[PDB]
Design a protein around this ligand. Structure first.
Ligand SMILES: *SCC1=CC(C)(C)N(O)C1(C)C
Length: 164
């Protein structure tokens, strides 16, 4: 298991524009196109992202390309963020992947707001961190996914993602 395989399981793969759990136009492996309710706006973002006129449809290679960019961007985002970098650096590689997964899903800003949870993680109080992480809109709206990420932070293993 690794961050790519982990997010591939959590985000799925779809080659046509679809709406994500929040109702937002998305494509590929969880590539958010826009929060605008206009399909035309989403299509424009997609053609820009891919570099051709796609009419709302891309290939698996194209999906994987955006995905690699989105993973890289999440991580570099973490490393440029004064609230996230110290926790990230303090973690082992498995729990690092959990933190990348959160940022991919909710953005740097949403995760930075988890300051109480981040402090518990910095302190390696893994069970306490897990309890605090669940007290969140994130857990309530995507509980199965949140449970997997929280298990990863609690155990520092991939147990929630193997057999899946
Ligand atoms: S969200 C940034 C942050 C603030 C403080 C409460 C000092 N923390 O421990 C972290 C780094 C979580």
């Amino acid at each position: 298991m690794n961050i790519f395989e982990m997010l591939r399981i959590d985000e799925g793969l779809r080659l046509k524009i679809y709406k994500d759990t929040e109702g937002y136009y998305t494509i590929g492996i969880g590539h958010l196109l826009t929060k605008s309710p206009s399909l035309n706006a989403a299509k424009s973002e997609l053609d820009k992202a891919i570099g051709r006129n796609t009419n709302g449809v891309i290939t698996k290679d194209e999906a994987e390309k955006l995905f690699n960019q989105d993973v890289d961007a999440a991580v570099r985002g973490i490393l440029r963020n004064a609230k996230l970098k110290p926790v990230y650096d303090s973690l082992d590689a498995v729990r690092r992947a959990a933190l990348i997964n959160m940022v991919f899903q909710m953005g740097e800003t949403g995760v930075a707001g988890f300051c109480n949870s981040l402090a518990m993680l910095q302190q390696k109080r893994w069970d306490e961190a897990a309890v605090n992480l669940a007290k969140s809109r994130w857990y309530n709206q995507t509980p199965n996914r949140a449970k997997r990420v929280i298990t990863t932070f609690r155990t520092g293993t991939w147990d929630a993602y193997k057999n899946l």
